[PDB]
Design a protein around this ligand. Structure first.
Ligand SMILES: C[C@@H](CC(=O)O)C(=O)C(=O)O
Ligand SMILES: [Zn+2]
Lengths: 330, 18
């Protein structure tokens, strides 16, 4: 609007080996949007006003008003901020994380951000912090001004469980969260800057090769999107994504179990996002066959969990599964 | 009992627990 030019251009997108097709961008009043959510397919909603009061947020406003709580800030010497569960690192002591978590005050995050910009350093930062009671007064008022009427009615219409968390995300241009899926429904509310989102449906599990359930990187893809090892991950040559770029005011529905790869646009400045994580609807009373892909994903996860428990050691899960299949099911 | 045991979903997300 106002003829301010192209918000972004394709030069700012990283290059990958797979094709994509676009996620629909719709008005929340469009019946097709309702259709996509009800069928757990991704959609970008352009006019929800979900986080309208937060669109004025920048680092200055937040430092002044977000309080003096602790904020988890991840640091990496690479653009890939691969998520890992610190609590599972015991199971895989040969795993050396490439990003480190550091607690700090918000003004320390801005200052550390400022230093890196001055020194031209290569270090990268990504703040990822659940919002909680410790936020300042004006942030509380903004939070209350979110469109709870709209999102509460979505939660009720879809039979979802409780809102578990709102994750505040502040990243540097070029930051990447590698492909993974979450076990909760997500309304991904973009606030500042532009994020390219590439989603893959649950039925491409075979092409994306998640880590073992007991690995710290459970639910994350093993494939290095920047250099896919096609000999270890041959079916990654069959992956096809759903792509969009969200900017301030957009809300992307990331359905539960859907893989997503998220990157802050190159040379786009900092990005700010707040997500809305809801527990999924319960498993229905009557089961309809054939099962959906995501039901099979749930089954596979539980098989891995139970074997790790029964065998008394996650390291024995792999060997037992191979014993099961070799010359029997393959 | 067993079929619903295997179909039961978790709720893990990309947010570190304390
Ligand atoms: C961590 C995040 C993506 C990002 O880096 O914005 C994500 O997967 C999510 O909100 O569920
Ligand atoms: Zn996610």
């Amino acid at each position: 609007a106002g003829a301010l030019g192209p918000a972004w251009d394709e030069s700012q997108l990283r290059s990958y080996s797979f094709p994509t097709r676009p996620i629909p961008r719709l008005s929340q009043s469009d019946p097709r949007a309702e259709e996509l959510i009800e069928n757990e397919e991704p959609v970008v909603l352009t006019d929800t006003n979900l986080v309208y009061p937060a669109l004025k947020w920048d680092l200055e406003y937040l430092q002044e008003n977000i309080g003096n709580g602790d904020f988890s800030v991840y640091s990496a010497s690479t653009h890939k901020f691969l998520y890992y569960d610190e609590k599972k690192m015991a199971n895989f002591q040969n795993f050396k994380p490439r990003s480190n978590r550091e607690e700090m005050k918000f003004h320390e995050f801005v200052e550390k951000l400022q230093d890196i910009q001055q020194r031209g350093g290569e270090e990268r930062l990504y703040l990822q912090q659940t919002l909680n009671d410790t936020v300042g007064r004006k942030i509380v008022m903004d939070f209350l001004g979110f469109n709870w009427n709209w999102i509460n009615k979505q939660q009720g219409k879809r039979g979802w469980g409780q809102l578990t968390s709102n994750l505040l995300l502040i990243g540097m241009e070029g930051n990447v969260t590698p492909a993974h899926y979450d076990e909760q429904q997500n309304f991904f509310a973009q606030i500042k800057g532009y994020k390219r989102c590439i989603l893959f449906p649950p039925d491409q599990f075979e092409c994306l090769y998640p880590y073992p359930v007991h690995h710290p990187c459970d639910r994350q893809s093993q494939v290095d999107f920047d250099n896919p090892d096609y000999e270890r991950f041959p079916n990654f040559q069959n992956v096809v994504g759903y792509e969009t770029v969200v900017g301030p005011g957009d809300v992307l529905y990331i359905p539960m179990y859907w893989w997503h790869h998220i990157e802050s646009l190159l040379n786009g400045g900092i990005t700010i996002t707040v997500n809305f994580w809801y527990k999924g609807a319960p498993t229905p009373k009557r089961i309809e066959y054939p099962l959906k892909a995501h039901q099979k994903v749930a089954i596979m996860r539980n098989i891995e969990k139970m074997l790790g428990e029964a065998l008394g050691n996650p390291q024995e899960v792999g060997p037992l599964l191979n014993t099961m299949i070799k010359g029997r099911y393959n | 009992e067993v079929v619903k045991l295997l179909l039961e979903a978790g709720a893990d997300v990309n947010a570190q627990d304390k």
